[PDB]
Design a protein around this ligand. Structure first.
Ligand SMILES: *[C@@H]1O[C@H](CO)[C@@H](O)[C@H](O)[C@H]1NC(C)=O
Lengths: 261, 99
């Protein structure tokens, strides 16, 4: 399963004359475009350089448009909620289509916020909404528009993207793993440079699912397009070897087991 | 509702002394996006430092990745310094080599 999502942000800071607008697009963990009002619409993924300038012309034109619209809206809502014009205000919007491994539409998403005040959100039923707040609580065709864009243009946009980056987008880079011994002991299981980001790290006291007494951080980016993740536990000085960590990941021949070397 | 950033300082590849590399400062879960992020070598704010495009998570909180190339040494001590609307005084996280 895959996701093509677009993010829009409208920022208002205390003092800034005009609101800042930025728009980025991702195809799963990978960002491939980017537009920033504090400047046109640039590429972010190496493989994007294969598009016609007629493309970026198109794209930049759209972002240009969306931006006028977004700023107008943020200002509108800051008004409706009658908030201090000068100071922080943020408008965030996300939309995207969930496409299956076989080019078929699985689902989609759309959500908009005047962070902390209003929320307008398309439901999974992709047929209903979720108003929230002074504005947008008073939210009203519009639906079919998205049902379409998402099933249509968006998916077309996705498929076309996969066409151009399958090589790097569908790769499977296995974790380089290892363990580390720290004294207060605490054993740490490391998984590095893996892609996709879906991975699994667990410990076991004598082959038994050992929960609670451990630590489970959050996958973080290596910086090159792959990820990192770790998990650790606390075990009685010396009484170590009764613990083993199991790594599971798409790019491995099979499960991997590690103990304090 | 403002939310202070979570900071992680680490290397792309494992710290191999005298061996080139990349130093990352990952800030996330913060709101608003007005954030200041610095990479320090022994204290002096490092020059040319790139950072990822701003994006947000499901809970609408923001995240960014700041980084630079760098050849660590057993002597050099590095760290990340962050200032945010939710911090009284800038937060400083020293890069632990074994983390
Ligand atoms: C052992 O831990 C795994 C980790 O997800 C869990 O799914 C499983 O239910 C546990 N034991 C079993 C097989 O019931």
């Amino acid at each position: 399963s895959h996701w093509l999502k677009t993010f829009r942000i409208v920022i208002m800071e205390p003092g800034i004359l005009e609101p800042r607008f930025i728009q980025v697009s991702y195809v799963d963990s990978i960002q491939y475009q980017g537009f920033d009002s504090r400047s046109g619409m640039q590429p972010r993924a190496a493989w994007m350089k294969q598009e016609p300038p007629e493309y970026w012309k198109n794209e930049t034109e759209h972002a240009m448009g969306a931006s006028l619209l977004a700023r107008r809206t943020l200002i509108y809502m800051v008004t409706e909620n009658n908030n201090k014009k000068n100071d922080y205000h943020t408008l965030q919007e996300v939309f995207g289509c969930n496409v299956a491994h076989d080019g078929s539409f699985l689902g989609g998403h759309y959500g908009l916020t005047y962070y902390g005040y209003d929320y307008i959100i398309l439901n999974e039923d992709l047929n209903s909404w979720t108003t929230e707040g002074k504005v947008g609580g008073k939210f009203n065709s519009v639906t079919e528009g998205w049902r379409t864009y998402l099933k249509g243009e968006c998916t077309e946009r996705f498929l076309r993207c996969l066409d151009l980056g399958k090589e790097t987008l569908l790769r499977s880079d296995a974790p380089r793993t290892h363990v580390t011994h720290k004294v207060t002991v605490t054993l740490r299981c490391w998984a590095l440079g893996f892609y996709p980001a879906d991975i699994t790290l667990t410990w076991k006291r004598d082959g038994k699912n050992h929960t609670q007494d451990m630590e489970l951080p959050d996958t973080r980016p290596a910086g090159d397009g792959t990820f990192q993740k770790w998990a650790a536990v606390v075990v009685p000085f010396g009484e170590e070897l009764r613990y083993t960590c199991h790594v599971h990941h798409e790019g491995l021949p099979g499960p991997l087991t590690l103990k304090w070397g | 509702i403002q939310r202070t950033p979570k900071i992680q300082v680490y290397s792309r590849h494992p710290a191999e002394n005298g061996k080139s590399n990349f130093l990352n400062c990952y800030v996330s879960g913060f709101h608003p996006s007005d954030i200041e992020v610095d990479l320090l070598k022994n204290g002096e704010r490092i020059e040319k430092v790139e950072h990822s495009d701003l994006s947000f998570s499901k809970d609408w909180s923001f995240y960014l990745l700041y980084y630079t190339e760098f050849t660590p040494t057993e002597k050099d001590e590095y760290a990340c310094r962050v200032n945010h609307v939710t911090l009284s005084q800038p937060k400083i996280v020293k890069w632990d080599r074994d983390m």
